[PDB]
Amino acid sequence: ANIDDLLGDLGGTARAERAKLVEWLLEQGITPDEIRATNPPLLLATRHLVGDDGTYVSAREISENYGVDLELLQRVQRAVGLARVDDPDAVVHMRADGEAAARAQRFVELGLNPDQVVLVVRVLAEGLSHAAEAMRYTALEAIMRPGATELDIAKGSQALVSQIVPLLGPMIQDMLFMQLRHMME
Amino acid sequence: NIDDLLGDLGGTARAERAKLVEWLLEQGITPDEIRATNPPLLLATRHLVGDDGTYVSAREISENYGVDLELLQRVQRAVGLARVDDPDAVVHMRADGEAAARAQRFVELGLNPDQVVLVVRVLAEGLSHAAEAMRYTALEAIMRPGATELDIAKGSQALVSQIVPLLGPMIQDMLFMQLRHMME
Ligand SMILES: CCCCCCCC/C=C/CCCCCCCC(=O)O
Ligand SMILES: CCCCCCCC/C=C\CCCCCCCC(=O)O
Incomplete structure (x- = not known):
């Protein structure tokens, strides 16, 4: 999941929690550029x-x-x-x-x-x-x-x-x- | 009927108020709303x-x-x-x-x-x-x-x-x- 570069340093239980969020954000029309420039997304x-x-x-x-x-x-x-x-x-x-x-x-x-x-x-x-x-x-x-x-x-x-x-x-x-x-x- | 609505105001401020009250009565306001609201x-x-x-x-x-x-x-x-x-x-x-x-x-x-x-x-x-x-x-x-x-x-x-x-x-x-x- 190359979206592994929108997760950054996040690990453990929180990395899966974020990965599912980025999954839903991308499928809303939200682009990789906005996700990276916004923590928390x-x-x-x-x-x-x-x-x-x-x-x-x-x-x-x-x-x-x-x-x-x-x-x-x-x-x-x-x-x-x-x-x-x-x-x-x-x-x-x-x-x-x-x-x-x-x-x-x-x-x-x-x-x-x-x-x-x-x-x-x-x-x-x-x-x-x-x-x-x-x-x-x-x-x-x-x-x-x-x-x-x-x-x-x-x-x-x-x-x-x-x-x-x-x-x-x-x-x-x-x-x-x-x-x-x-x-x- | 304006004379009552002028209240205690006299002299210069009275004639001013007089003109204002004649205007407000045409604008639909009742003598009650003028009495109850001072300044009107x-x-x-x-x-x-x-x-x-x-x-x-x-x-x-x-x-x-x-x-x-x-x-x-x-x-x-x-x-x-x-x-x-x-x-x-x-x-x-x-x-x-x-x-x-x-x-x-x-x-x-x-x-x-x-x-x-x-x-x-x-x-x-x-x-x-x-x-x-x-x-x-x-x-x-x-x-x-x-x-x-x-x-x-x-x-x-x-x-x-x-x-x-x-x-x-x-x-x-x-x-x-x-x-x-x-x-x-
Ligand atoms: C970006 C915001 C710009 C702010 C604009 C200022 C708003 C203007 C104010 C509204 C005036 C209307 C209020 C009426 C009060 C009557 C005064 C009175 O008692 O005689
Ligand atoms: C006369 C009743 C007035 C009602 C007041 C309205 C209550 C306001 C409650 C929530 C609206 C605010 C929406 C934005 C909140 C931030 C949510 C977020 O970004 O996490």
Whole structure:
């Protein structure tokens, strides 16, 4: 099994546990290049559901592609605070993360202050990254059972995130407006 | 009939308020909602964020949207915005009850109720901070020297109407932005 070179240094009971996972990952459309560049491979057949497709871009690439100001965009990228960033040409931004930052420009175009917009992003990124860890453990509790293998987790993880994701979007959307309805007074 | 609605305000602030109240009454707002809401500045903006002025009880919500009352009441407490704790008090906005009823859907996938409620709490924490900063961001743009109370109202109705369609997707996109991050 030449896939013996995606297993690396893993031995014992864990090498068989990994081999079965790589078996299922490869047969999902996942390529050897992604598996090698991701330890643990676990979340590979799952990360596509939250918008991550392994495609990376640079701030300048985002700036030209989506027709946005580079300076303001990179301010918003510091505000979300996700990738070690400060070079317009570092291809280190997830394609979807890049498109998400390009929308901030639109709020500034509606007369809202670019200093304030960047601040709102900062507060949101702070609040959502705390809910993120509450979300991580909630799902992990739901998919970790007796003595499940790597594959068991990857299969359970893919199944659960698939059902959950269509709900999360309109959920948090409903949540934000609930706060907007009660901060109003 | 406006004279009652002006309250104790006099002089300059009264004539301003007078014009604002004549506007709000045309916009469908009842004298009750104006009395109960002081300042009444943003009553013409509330319907742009989901507030249709109609209220429901936890009983109405639980049966209609078909969700468990106990979980519903827990979720409403985690949001920490309406604290009347009794089943049949008609004190919840219709839009909020709809939003709180979404909790049940997550539980019925095998997710733990205690953690579902916890995540609700941690979200309402972040969004309340965020909404506060949003209000000050909005207020800055809608506001400039010597603008009447009516001026701020018509302008905030114009500005908020433009921002709303982008906010939903924005908060949605910002959620997945952080979710992708956990996974790597
Ligand atoms: C990348 C995210 C960019 C952040 C953009 C900032 C969002 C703009 C905020 C929304 C304003 C609408 C809220 C209405 C509050 C009304 C203020 C008032 O009380 O008079
Ligand atoms: C009003 C009720 C609110 C319901 C809160 C939703 C509960 C969130 C639970 C799980 C969704 C998060 C999905 C991502 C978790 C990480 C999984 C993983 O990558 O291993």
